Amino acid sequence: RTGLAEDGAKSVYERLKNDRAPYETRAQNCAQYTIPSLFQTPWQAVGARGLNNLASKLMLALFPMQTWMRLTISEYEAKQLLSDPDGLAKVDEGLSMVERIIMNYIESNSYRVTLFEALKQLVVAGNVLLYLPEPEGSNYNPMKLYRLSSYVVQRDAFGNVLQMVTRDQIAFGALPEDIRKAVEGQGGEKKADETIDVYTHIYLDEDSGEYLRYEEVEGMEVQGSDGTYPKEACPYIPIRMVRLDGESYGRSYIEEYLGDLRSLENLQEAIVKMSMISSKVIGLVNPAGITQPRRLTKAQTGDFVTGRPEDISFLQLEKQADFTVAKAVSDAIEARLSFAFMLNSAVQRTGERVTAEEIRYVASELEDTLGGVYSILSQELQLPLVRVLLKQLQATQQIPELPKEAVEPTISTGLEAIGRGQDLDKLERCVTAWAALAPMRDDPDINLAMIKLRIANAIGIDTSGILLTEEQKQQKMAQ
Amino acid sequence: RTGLAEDGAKSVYERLKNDRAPYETRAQNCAQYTIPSLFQTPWQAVGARGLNNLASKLMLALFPMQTWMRLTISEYEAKQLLSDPDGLAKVDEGLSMVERIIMNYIESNSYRVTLFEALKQLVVAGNVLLYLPEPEGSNYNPMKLYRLSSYVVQRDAFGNVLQMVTRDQIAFGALPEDIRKAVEGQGGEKKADETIDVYTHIYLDEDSGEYLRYEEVEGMEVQGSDGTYPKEACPYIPIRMVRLDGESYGRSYIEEYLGDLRSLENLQEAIVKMSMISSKVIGLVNPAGITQPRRLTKAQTGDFVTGRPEDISFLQLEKQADFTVAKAVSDAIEARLSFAFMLNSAVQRTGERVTAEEIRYVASELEDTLGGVYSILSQELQLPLVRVLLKQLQATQQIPELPKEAVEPTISTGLEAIGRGQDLDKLERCVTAWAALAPMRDDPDINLAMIKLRIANAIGIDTSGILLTEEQKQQKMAQ
Amino acid sequence: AIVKMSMISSKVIGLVNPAGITQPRRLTKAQTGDFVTGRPEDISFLQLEKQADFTVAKAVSDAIEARLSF
């Protein structure tokens, strides 16, 4: 074979590993000051608690136990079945069964627990790509996360992906049997401890636009694992926190705010260290004085010992005056970071009893920030995940066959998909605004048929199978 | 035998014991500053009280006395019985009897009391695996918890488990009779005191994908205990607090926040030690002065003694100035840890009378954190537990036989499963939104049949056996 | 400049008079609750004590922070 792997994947991995190195060190920097174990352990938990809340508060809105995508009938299909109501009813029933299948798959296949780490890592790193390869209908298809450190990607100036490579080091103890043999014959006498790196390369076929995979184990192949992928659906997904116009990767959310994060840690730790000095009781006996250490060190309470106070002092550094200046600043940054990590208690920074309304106003800002990040993250990670899972399930045919109208639907996400839809809110607000013109349903020179429409128009309902057609209006008026 | 135990389990235990050693020391560190007896006794209880609340507050939502899983009819089975209502009713009745069986089993078999320690340990340690081996319908099947220290596990880069080993040291006084003989018929005259380590090895059969067990007692076997396990259902469960992309184990929740926990202990204990010094009354008599200790030490109140005040002083270290600097920081960390241990009283950190609303906002952040951790922990520990118990009970046939439609159901957990379902909330909100279009049930040119659907669509009800079918609509209109 | 300033205020440096009896080693190593030979006068700490200027800087940083915020 040739193409983009003219001489293996390792070669392509090393070539891109130089473009990735800035993002990689940036990610390790962010991790150090927040929670390091995502790339020893820091002097504050402020950043840590923030990142934790940011992941929680994100996924609980993005990936809750509620159904959070709604498949809508394709526009042409909707048009083709116009005002054929029994069928359209059954179609929604069909896709809204699909709604449940993928969800009941996700909750059982343990996608959520990994998507947590995915968001955590996607926040501190900027990129963190996901494999959901083998449905294997019978058993667990666990999701697999490849953190920024142990993978690499290349893109074109548009956004499209050409080639990605992922390294996995497992030590030959926990290898599948096909590679265990393809390894121990070409290599040496291996042990469970040693450690083997299995690269994985995906090209874009340079004419028949489709992704091709193979698995390299030291300038070799797996002698079996190589499979194909269409461009539209690839079970190998590279997400992106904070896009850039070109490049290949994306910016850690927790970067622009690090300027202060670093400022806080290197200060916080000095304060903690300072406190540890203030707390230390050391007693300075004048060796020229009469008061001798032992008689005190051993003396219990209520005693009387020979000596005067002047022979003894205690360290008493008394630099509160500086401390208060350091603290007053540590809290000022802690507050700014708090607001930047969606952390309620941005509202309370001591002072006075912040009154009841400048809470629900500061709240609206925090909700705006989370909502903006939510919409981007939702739109980018949420839809690629759904589109891939939909195609995978259609291929295995765990989707008991549908009518023609539900082979290619559209994929509403976020609010619309859960109960509290705005489609709905528009619908019910119109119905009530229709109840409004009851006191003139017996209209002397007032045309309800027209108003009843213009209202639904301004609100923006479909008005399809709603306003009884001129013919159906006249037909029903006689009954 | 051979496979993954080419020469016993002890060998595999020792090989993996080196990969486990970092997690193990990390766990002992966490424990030291929280509650140490989970791996002498510390100077503060803050962390202790936090871990306690964290376990309580978790399990009370995860594992309450209420029924907290609901088995739903498999999707194909639902489709196959579409609009056959008497049967579907009876099906729900059937699984909702299964709902009660497993629960009545769990409450009687004392699962909750162990699952407490499981969560406590899973919080401080990162992993803590669970055995629920023998149903023994007649009596107690107690749950068995193997703490991180006395077990070990290996995984593949996917999540799947290959081999686990558990050590149990009991001293030959409390051994079953088969090992008691298989032990003293190899190794020595043994007393009730001595102490015997029984290892326990589980392979993945390297072609007929199924878990195989045996029980080793010193490079030997139990001569009986060896049994098999299918891959889908193993009564040997390894949970995971905070996943990692690879490895084998998981991260203690109480790790990233330790950075401050350690900082607090080593300070707190200095303060306590400082206080004990401040409280100590030592009286310094000048031996050159006239005032003599005896006369005072023995003198009662209201007396008059010969001497002047200048001959006597008291220790008076007077380093409040430093203390206030130390305290002001101890409380600042105490507050950040409190928030990180779901501890209400995160809201009150003295200052002023925190007003009425920036409580229910700081609450929403604490509920979000607990809710996120809950969803992961629920999804990971809750569903593996249920799936295992369901299969075990089906095998012993304590599940009086069901129709074909309830051999492989789906397993809803969390909110859906208890009364307050979102499925329910959507249903009732639609029904009321339908009551909304009563003032136009006598519709002049307004099609209710269509609106009454589109509402249930936007909300996301099934609409199955709800909107009377075109034929059933026309059939009932004549009656 | 404030962040930098704080970093200076936080820094604990202890000035032993080399003419005095109180010697660094015995303190640096001494744990809490101890007694060491020497007097307080031989030792001080840096104590820059320019809060007076800080407060003037802060009161202005926050005034601009407020206008930018809006």
DSSP-assigned letters across all residues of A94-152: HHHHHHHHHHHHHHHTTHHHHHHHHHHHHHHTS-EEEE-----TTS----EEEEGGGEE
Question: What experiment produced this structure?
Answer: X-ray
Q: What is the rounded distance in angstroms from the CA atom of residue A214 to the CA atom of residue A226? A: 4
How many Å is the Cα radius of gyration of chain C? 19
The two tokens of residue B160 are 């799947």
B273 shares contact with chain C (CB less than 8 Å): yes
- What would the DSSP string read from start to end of A377-426? HIIIIIHHHHHHHHHHHHHHT-S----GGGSS-EEEESTTTSSS-HHHHH
Residue B104 CB-density burial (10 A; 0-12 exposed, 13-18 middle, 19+ buried)? exposed
**Spatial distance between the Cα atoms of B175 and B165, rounded to a whole number of angstroms:** 19
Q: What are phi and psi of B131, to 5 degrees?
A: -115, 125
DSSP H helical ranges for B279-353: 293-298, 320-340
C-alpha B456/C-alpha B467 separation (Å) is: 10
> Which residue in A44, A192, A467 is closest to B260 by CB distance?
A44
Interface test with B, best of A345, A430, A432, A471 (most B CBs within 10 A): A345
In sequence order, the 6+-apart residues with CB closer than 8 A to the CB of C36 are: A282, A283, A284, A285, C22, C26, C27, C30
Q: How far apart are the first and last CA of chain C?
A: 24
Contact by Cβ (8 Å): A450, A439: no
The chains in contact with chain B, meaning 3 or more Cβ pairs closer than 8 Å, are A, C
Which uninterrupted H or E stretch holds A177? helix A177-184
Q: What's the token pair of residue A277?
A: 């000095």
Whether B380 contacts B66, CB under 8 Å:
no
Q: Which tokens is B472 given?
A: 């059933």
* Local structure of A312: helix, strand or coil: strand
Nearest to A131 by CA among B157, B240, B375, B156: B157
Long-range contacts from A422-429, C-beta under 8 angstroms, 24+ separation: A423/B458, A424/B433, A424/B455, A424/B458, A424/B459, A426/A459, A426/A460, A426/A461, A427/A461, A427/B451, A427/B454, A427/B455, A427/B458, A428/B433, A428/B436, A428/B455, A429/A459
A299 close contact with B: CB closer than 8 A: yes
Buried b / exposed e over B379-412, threshold 16 CB at 10 Å, is bbbbbbbbebbbebbeeeeebeeeeebbeebbbb
Number of CB atoms found within 10 A of residue A288's CB: 9
Which tokens is B195 given?
A: 């102490």
| 3-state SS class at B314 | strand
Question: Nearest residue on chain B to C34, judged by CA atoms?
Answer: B277
Cβ atoms of residues A463 and A456 within 8 Å: yes
The answer to whether A204 and A156 are in contact (CB under 8 A) is no
Minimum Cα–Cα distance from A365: chain C residue: C69
Q: Which residue has the tokens 């629900």?
A: A360
Which chains, if any, share at least 3 CB pairs under 8 A with chain A?
B, C
Instruction: Measure the CA–CA gap between A344 and A399, rounded to whole angstroms.
Output: 43
Note which residues in 24-63 of chain C have CB less than 8 A from chain A: 27, 30-40, 43, 45-49, 51, 54, 58
State the alpha helices, DSSP H only, in B406-479. Answer: 422-435, 448-459, 470-477
- Burial (CB count within 10 angstroms: exposed 0-12, middle 13-18, buried 19+), residue B101: middle
Residues 6+ apart with CB under 8 A from B408: B74
What residues in B contact C32, CB-CB < 8 Å?
Answer: 270, 273-274
Structure tokens at A431: 């119905």
Closest-CA distance of chain C to residue B468, Å: 57
A229 touches chain C (CB under 8 A): no
- Give the Å distances, CA to CA, from B447 to A73, A463, A473, A475, B208: 21, 10, 10, 13, 61
Q: How far is CA B68 from the centre of its chain?
A: 15
Which residues, 6+ apart, have CB-to-CB distance to B317 below 8 Å?
A281, A283, A314, B277, B278
Is C16 within 8 Å of chain A by CB?
Answer: no
Do B463 and A96 make contact, defined as CB atoms within 8 angstroms?
yes
Query: Please, which contacts does A425-430 make with residues 24 or more away whose CB atoms are closer than 8 Å?
Result: A426/A459, A426/A460, A426/A461, A427/A461, A427/B451, A427/B454, A427/B455, A427/B458, A428/B433, A428/B436, A428/B455, A429/A459, A430/A455, A430/A456, A430/A459, A430/A461
Largest CA distance in chain A: 121
Q: Which H/E stretch holds residue A456?
A: helix A448-459
Q: After which residues is chain B broken (C to N over 2.5 A)?
A: 39
CB A322 to CB C40 under 8 A? no
Q: Identify the CA nearest to B191 among candidates B170, B169, B173, B164.
A: B173
Instruction: Please name the residue that has the structure tokens 């409580």.
Output: B359
CB contact under 8 A, A270 and C11: yes
Q: Resolution for this model in angstroms, one decimal place?
A: 3.6
CB burial of residue A165 (10 Å; 0-12, 13-18, 19+): buried
Task: Please answer yes or no on whether A423 and B458 come within 8 Å at the CB atom.
Answer: yes
What lies within 8 Å, CB to CB, of A284 at 6+ separation is A312, A313, A314, A315, C22, C35, C36, C37, C38, C39, C40
- Alpha carbon dihedral A177, A179, A181, A183, in 10-degree steps, equals -150
Q: Rounded to an integer, what distance in angstroms lies between the CA atom of residue B241 and that of residue B376? A: 8
From A207's Cα to the closest Cα of chain B, the distance in A is 33
Distance from the first to the final alpha carbon of chain B: 75
Q: Look up residue A174 and give its two tokens.
A: 């926990």
Distance from CA of A206 to the nearest CA of B (A): 31
Nearest chain B CA: its distance from A113 CA (Å): 5
Distance from C-alpha of A1 to C-alpha of A205, rounded to nearest angstrom = 12
The H or E element that residue A153 is part of is strand A151-155
Asked whether the beta carbons of B159 and A140 are under 8 A apart, the reply is: yes
Task: Return d(Cα A345, Cα A347) in angstroms, integer.
Answer: 5
Residue A50 amino acid letter: G
- How far apart are alpha carbons B416 and A168 in whole angstroms? 38
Burial of A285 (0-12, 13-18, 19+ CB in 10 A): buried
Chain A interface includes B233 (CB < 8 A): no
Identify from B263, B345, B359 which residue to disrupt to test chain A contact, counting A C-beta atoms within 10 A and taking the largest count.
B263
B215's tokens: 């029980």
Please give the Cα distance from B198 to B170 (Å, whole number): 8
Most distant CA pair in chain C: distance in Å? 59
Shortest Cα–Cα distance, A317 to chain C (Å): 6
Pick the closest to residue A432 from A410, A412, A414, A459 (CA basis): A459
Strands laid side by side in the B128-131 sheet = B144-147, B128-131, B236-237
B277 at interface of C, judged by CB pairs closer than 8 A: yes
Q: Is B309 on the interface with A (CB under 8 A)?
A: no
Distance CA B306, CA B310 (A): 12
C17 in A contact zone (CB under 8 Å): no
Dist CA C58 CA C48 (whole Å): 17
Neighbours of A118 (CB within 10 A): 27
Dist CA A159 CA A380 (whole Å): 12
Helices A46-62 and A258-278 sit at what angle, rounded to 10 degrees?
Answer: 140
The C-alpha atoms of residue B171 and residue B174 are separated, in whole angstroms, by 7
Does residue B252 contact residue B124 with C-beta atoms inside 8 Å?
yes
* Enclosing H/E stretch for B228: strand B228-230
The torsion defined by the Cα of B427, B433, B434 and B437, in degrees rounded to 10, comes to 180
Query: How would you class B201 by CB atoms within 10 Å of its CB: exposed for 0-12, middle for 13-18, buried for 19 or more?
Result: buried
Q: What tokens were used for A429?
A: 């607000």
Q: Do A113 and B376 touch (CB under 8 A)?
A: yes
Q: Report the 10 Å Cβ neighbour count for A50.
A: 24
- Give the closest-approach CA distance of B180 to chain A in angstroms: 34
Q: How far is A312 from chain B (nearest CA, A)?
A: 8
List of chain B residues whose C-beta atoms are within 8 Å of the C-beta of residue A468 = 445-447
Chain C: residue nearest B269 by CA?
Answer: C32
**CA C59 distance to own-chain centroid:** 22
Please tell me whether residue A284 adopts helix, strand or coil conformation. strand
Show the CA angle centred on residue A380, arms to residues A378 and A381, nearest 5°: 70
Q: Which of B317, B284, B341 minimizes the C-alpha distance to B123?
A: B341
**Is residue A272 less than 8 Å (CB to CB) from chain C?**
no
Residue C5: closest CA among chain A residues belongs to which residue? A326
Cα C64 from Cα A325, distance rounded (Å): 19
Q: For residue B422, give the chain A residue with the closest CA.
A: A66
Contacts with A360 from chain B: Cβ below 8 Å: 357
Q: From CA A456, how far away is CA A450, in angstroms rounded?
A: 10
A282-285 and C34-37 beta bridge pairing: parallel
Q: Point out which residues pair with B201 in neighbouring strands.
A: B165, B214
Answer whether C27 sits within 8 Å of A321, measured CB to CB. Answer: no
Instruction: Please choose, from the candidates B404, B407, B413, the residue with its C-alpha nearest in 3D space to the C-alpha of residue B386.
Output: B413
Q: What are phi and psi of A231, to 5 degrees?
A: -65, -50
B362 in reach of chain C (CB within 8 A): no
Among C9, C32, C35, C43, the strongest candidate for a mutation testing the B interface, having the largest count of B CBs within 10 A, is: C32
| Order of strands, sheet of A282-285, starting from the edge strand that comes earlier in the sequence | A312-314, A282-285, C34-37
Strands of the sheet containing B312-314, edge to edge, are A303-306, B282-285, B312-314
Q: Cβ contacts of residue B199 below 8 Å, gap of 6+?
A: B8, B9, B10, B13, B165, B166, B167, B215, B216, B217
Residues just before a chain gap in chain C (C–N exceeding 2.5 Å) are none
Shortest Cα distance, chain A CAs vs residue C23, angstroms: 11
Rounded to an integer, what distance in angstroms lies between the CA atom of residue B72 and that of residue B94? Answer: 11
Q: Whole-angstrom Cα distance, residue B268 to residue B326? A: 9
What's the number of CA atoms in the CB half-sphere (13 Å) around residue B440? 27
What is the CA A190 to chain-centroid distance, rounded?
39
* CB within 8 Å of B61: residues ≥ 6 apart: B370, B374
From the list A169, A164, A58, A69, the residue with the least C-alpha distance to A117 is A58
- Secondary structure (3-state) at A282: strand
With CA atoms as reference, report the closest residue to B5 among B169, B179, B215: B215
* Residue A14 to residue B289: CA distance in whole angstroms: 85
Angle between the B258-278 and B320-340 helix axes, to the nearest 10 degrees? 150
Residues 6 or more apart in contact with residue B458 via CB below 8 angstroms:
A416, A421, A423, A424, A427
Query: Which among A297, A319, A326 has CB closest to C47?
Result: A319
Q: What are the tokens at B32? A: 């030291």
CA distances for B439 relative to A424, A438, B277, B454, B459, angstroms: 19, 8, 81, 18, 22
Instruction: Locate the chain C residue with the closest alpha carbon to B325.
Output: C10
What is the distance between the alpha carbons of residues B462 and A93, in angstroms, rounded to a whole number?
A: 6
Provide the angle, in degrees to the nearest 10, between the axes of the packed helices A320-340 and A46-62.
10
- Does any CB of chain B come closer than 8 Å to the CB of residue A399? no
Q: Do C33 and B273 touch (CB under 8 A)?
A: yes
Cα A334 to Cα A353: distance, rounded to the nearest angstrom: 19
B440, closest residue in chain A (CA to CA): A435
CA A305 → CA A142, A290, A302, C39, distances in Å? 74, 10, 10, 20
Distance CA B16, CA B475 (A): 71
User: CA C4 to CA A423: how far, in whole Å?
Assistant: 53
DSSP assignment string, A36-63: GGG----S-SHHHHHHHHHHHHHHHHHS
Give me Rg for the CA atoms of chain A: 33
Q: CB distance A281–B273 less than 8 Å? A: yes
C15 has which bridge partners?
C44
Evaluate whether A291 touches B286 at the Cβ level (below 8 Å). no
Does the beta carbon of B315 lie under 8 angstroms from any beta carbon of chain C?
A: no
Helical pair A258-278 and C2-9, crossing angle rounded to 10 deg: 20
Neighbors of chain C by Cβ distance (3+ pairs < 8 Å): A, B
CB contact B359 to A (< 8 Å): no
Which alpha helices (H) appear in chain C, and where do they start and end?
2-9, 24-29, 51-69
